[PDB]
Structure 1
Amino acid sequence: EAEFGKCGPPPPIDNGDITSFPLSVYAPASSVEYQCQNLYQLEGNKRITCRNGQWSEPPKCLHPCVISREIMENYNIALRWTAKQKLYSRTGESVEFVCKRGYRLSSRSHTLRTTCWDGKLEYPTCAKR
């Protein structure tokens, strides 16, 4: 009851999992950090803890900073580093898009510098050069 209660494998997130490697036999009342595969970045409580041989449920994974590469680097916009696309990051990192030295925001555009999350960055358009 108090001594016997070792938990089992800890439940994963939406395409997530422990920041190490899934365990089959875990220590009771033990907790660990979670993370999502690839550039996927969850949100909530990646730190899960098993209770009486019954874990909890990790937070929620957020689609990485995967914006459109056929639209940004297409018309005339890229990253603040200007290196072809470079529109990929880990959900939670800042992603500043440029209007390609020359072209100026077409107004109807969204924003240059922003934050990627769930696969969204509000890519502008820009026009000039």
Structure 2
Amino acid sequence: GKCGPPPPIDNGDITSFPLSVYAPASSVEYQCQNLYQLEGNKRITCRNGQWSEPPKCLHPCVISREIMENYNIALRWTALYSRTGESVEFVCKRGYRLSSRSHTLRTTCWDGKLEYPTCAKR
């Protein structure tokens, strides 16, 4: 029961050079592209001619310059991309007030989804 080449995953690849054929109980590991987050077991194993399930690569968020502008917000602690799981902090632009919910200036990027707060002229 040999396996054949491990399956592809989006935005990532195996950490080894692939083989044509793979012994039973052999394993390979995956790595995601920069700023992508591995979800699931990064290792797969060959057994009974089949591979176990490969991981997935969770997207980072590409922070919009600027939906930030038409929401009248900017980044606090100014220096962008954020990783899945990272919190990002915003401020209202000068002369503006938070018009979204009370907490919405701090938000968490997840798999490419980021909830922008909004501000409005006071």
Q: TM-score, normalised by structure 1?
A: 0.67
Correspondences of 1:1-129 after superposition (within 5 Å): 7-19=3-15, 22-24=18-20, 26=22, 28-83=24-79, 87-100=80-93, 103-107=96-100, 111-128=104-121
Q: Number of aligned residue pairs: give it.
A: 122
Contact 1:97 1:113 in 2 (8 A): yes
Q: CA deviation at 1:62?
A: 2.2
- Which has the larger share of strand? 2
Summarize the Cα distance change of 1:10–1:108 in structure 2 as closer, same or farther, 3 Å threshold: same
Q: CA deviation at 1:81?
A: 2.1
The 4+ residue runs of structure 1 with deviation greater than 4 A are 19-27
Q: CA deviation at 1:10?
A: 1.7
**Paired residue secondary structure (2:51):** coil
Q: TM-score, normalised by structure 2?
A: 0.70
What per-residue deviation string (whole Å, max 9, x for no partner) do you get for residues 55-95 of structure 1? Answer: 23313332221243221145432223223xxx411222222
Give unpaired runs (5+ residues) of structure 2. none
Contact 1:109 1:124 in 2 (8 A): no
Summarize the Cα distance change of 1:126–1:13 in structure 2 as closer, same or farther, 3 Å threshold: same
Summarize the Cα distance change of 1:58–1:107 in structure 2 as closer, same or farther, 3 Å threshold: same
**Paired residue secondary structure (2:69):** helix
**Structure 2 Cα separation of the partners of residues 111 and 59 of structure 1:** 31
Contact 1:39 1:65 in 2 (8 A): no
- RMSD between superposed Cα atoms in Å: 3.1
